[PDB]
Design a protein around this ligand. Structure first.
Ligand SMILES: [Mg+2]
Ligand SMILES: [Mg+2]
Ligand SMILES: [Mg+2]
Ligand SMILES: [Mg+2]
Ligand SMILES: [Mg+2]
Ligand SMILES: [Mg+2]
Ligand SMILES: [Mg+2]
Ligand SMILES: [Mg+2]
Ligand SMILES: [Mg+2]
Ligand SMILES: [Mg+2]
Ligand SMILES: [Mg+2]
Ligand SMILES: [Mg+2]
Ligand SMILES: [Mg+2]
Ligand SMILES: [Mg+2]
Ligand SMILES: [Mg+2]
Ligand SMILES: [Mg+2]
Ligand SMILES: [Mg+2]
Ligand SMILES: [Mg+2]
Lengths: 122, 70, 123, 85
RNA sequence: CCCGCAGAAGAAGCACCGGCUAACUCCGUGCCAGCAGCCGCGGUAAUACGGAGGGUGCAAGCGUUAAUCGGAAUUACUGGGC
RNA sequence: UAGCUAGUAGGUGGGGUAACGGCUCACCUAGGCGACGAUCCCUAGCUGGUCUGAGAGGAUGACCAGCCACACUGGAACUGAGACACGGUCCAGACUCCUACGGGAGGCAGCAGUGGGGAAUAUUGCACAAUGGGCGCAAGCCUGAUGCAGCCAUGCCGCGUG
């Protein structure tokens, strides 16, 4: 359950360290972003020579939430933190080339195949 | 976008808004007069040449008095 | 004087400064010609000296003289830069190497052709 | 690996297990002597010393340790045993 | 490496020439174009720019740049000064 | 850069090392270094030597030879006479690659070579015939050490171009 002002960790190596959700995309009055969801972010913390700069406004896909995903059998997969992968603002197309931590099958789509391949787990 | 509220009267405020608009458009569209570049004065050019020629004569007199007529 | 005073604080040599700092103790450097223009000399001189603002590979942004009569340099020409100031151009401590690396030679030069980068004529 | 370094790795792990067993046993007997000493029984300390002396001597012979190390163990264990009283 | 063959054949350039510094004239250009290490040179008779003829130096090299020491007694101990 | 130091400086004892040693530990003492520059900062492999210089000196440490340090980065030990090990082990990291996604592999600052950077520096050569080195009783095998060859006026030297 990511909303505006929620701070997420960055699961790729694009250079960002902490980002803030500034908009849950898709739908008027939409409140939360689950895992496979695209959000608008600003970069609150970045590394000095990274591919992104602090204060940059761009997109991101959620990949891990503390709230977690529920599976059709009722099972739940929760994580110890909310993470996201940064995407280019026009084409999603993840910015980084690595991806840290596990992801979920919820990300198995046509646009996040790069993420599902680069992920070290699930 | 102008906000004119100086006066208790809306008509005064409306004319003040139009006056602000006109003053701003005038100050923003008045063209700065162009600055054509100036050259050294030909008097100064002749001064340069004259100083050069004088030092030329002095340096010609100075230094080496070789041939020696000997 | 006073060998005792010298034993206390020895004689300090005059550490020389380089007049070609952008070369960084290299014979030549490579640049990009961020600008090509003419300058007036100083002093008593009077001319229109052909000169280029050059960004070097080591990051230095310097000013280099283009010697010889006529050049083909422009706002993005990659050229080679050697030492040597102009002595009547303030701030020009380098020469462009003609006939080397995208800076052409000089037309119709018959004497001192190795300078200005001119190949031997037909003869 | 790329060489006969593979055989050396195998042999070194084998010798590592062997030497580890031997070293553990040797310093276990040394600990026996030291515990007997810090208990205060000169007779038990001497018994443990006589039990350990051939061990450290044979290990210094095998090359597990050095003759100097074995001699040093024996020397500064005899010293404590004698000063125990 | 030696012997034989053939034929002068297949094999010179670079810099410089005002003074320092060795080696000078003409032409074209006209404070321009340009040169320059320093001093400087160039505004219609330029040994200093550009070409030519002539010359000087070095030569399968010759120049330029960079760098070090020298010259620099210009940090002076040898060997300076106030 | 004027103060630095608490295992710090010393002692006793224990442990440890091939070996002495605060090497380590417990206790005791309150010392120890420093204006003859401690500490801190910047830069740097050191030497024989090289260049220059009449020397004294200044600059320098390419080649060759001696010593040191390093081996993708940071640690660690193991084995061994000898290593905390360039073409060994383990762990962690970054990067590259394989994967059936579970997991694996790698380290040219060896010789060639590639890309890159650069003003700029060479062949993916031949042979172990010499001399060395490893192993072997030897024969022999291995040896990008080395001997040679290729490229380059980079230097020095000689000769030619009559
Ligand atoms: Mg002891
Ligand atoms: Mg003369
Ligand atoms: Mg000179
Ligand atoms: Mg004339
Ligand atoms: Mg002339
Ligand atoms: Mg001197
Ligand atoms: Mg004086
Ligand atoms: Mg002690
Ligand atoms: Mg100091
Ligand atoms: Mg260094
Ligand atoms: Mg002298
Ligand atoms: Mg490397
Ligand atoms: Mg051992
Ligand atoms: Mg090895
Ligand atoms: Mg290797
Ligand atoms: Mg390049
Ligand atoms: Mg051999
Ligand atoms: Mg082999």
């Amino acid at each position: 359950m990511i909303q505006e002002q929620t701070m997420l960790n960055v699961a790729d190596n694009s250079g960002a360290r902490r980002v803030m959700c500034i908009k849950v995309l898709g739908g008027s009055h939409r409140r939360y972003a689950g895992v496979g969801d695209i959000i608008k972010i600003t970069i609150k913390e970045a590394i000095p020579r990274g591919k992104v700069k602090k204060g940059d406004v761009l997109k991101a896909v959620v990949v891990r939430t503390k709230k977690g995903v529920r599976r059709p059998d009722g099972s739940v997969i929760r994580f110890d933190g909310n993470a996201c992968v940064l995407l280019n603002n026009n084409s999603e197309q993840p910015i980084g080339t690595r991806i840290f931590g596990p992801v979920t099958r919820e990300l198995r789509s046509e646009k996040f195949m790069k993420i599902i391949s680069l992920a070290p787990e699930v | 976008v102008i906000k004119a509220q100086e006066y208790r009267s809306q008509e005064l405020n409306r004319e003040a808004a139009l006056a602000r608009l006109v003053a701003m458009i005038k100050e923003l569209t008045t063209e700065k007069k162009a600055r054509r570049p100036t050259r050294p004065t030909r008097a100064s050019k002749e001064r340069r040449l004259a100083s050069k020629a004088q030092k030329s004569s002095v340096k010609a007199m100075r230094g080496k008095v070789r041939s020696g007529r000997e | 004087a006073t060998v005792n005073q010298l034993v206390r604080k020895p004689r300090a040599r005059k550490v020389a400064k380089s007049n070609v700092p952008a070369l960084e103790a290299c014979p030549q450097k490579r640049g990009v010609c961020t600008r090509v223009y003419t300058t007036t000399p100083k002093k008593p001189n009077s001319a229109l000296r052909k000169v280029c603002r050059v960004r070097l590979t080591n990051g230095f942004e310097v000013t280099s003289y283009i010697g010889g009569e006529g050049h083909n340099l422009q706002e993005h020409s990659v050229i080679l830069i050697r030492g040597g100031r102009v002595k009547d151009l303030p701030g020009v401590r380098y020469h462009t190497v003609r006939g080397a690396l995208d800076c052409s030679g000089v037309k119709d030069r018959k004497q001192a052709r190795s300078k200005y980068g001119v190949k031997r004529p037909k003869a | 690996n790329i060489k006969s370094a593979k055989k050396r790795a195998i042999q070194s792990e084998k010798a590592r297990k062997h030497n580890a067993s031997r070293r553990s046993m040797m310093r276990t007997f040394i600990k026996k002597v030291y515990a007997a000493i810090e208990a205060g029984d000169k007779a038990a300390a001497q018994k443990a010393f006589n039990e350990m002396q051939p061990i450290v001597d044979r290990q210094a012979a095998k090359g597990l340790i050095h003759k100097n190390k074995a001699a040093r163990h024996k020397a500064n264990l005899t010293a404590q045993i004698n000063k125990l009283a």
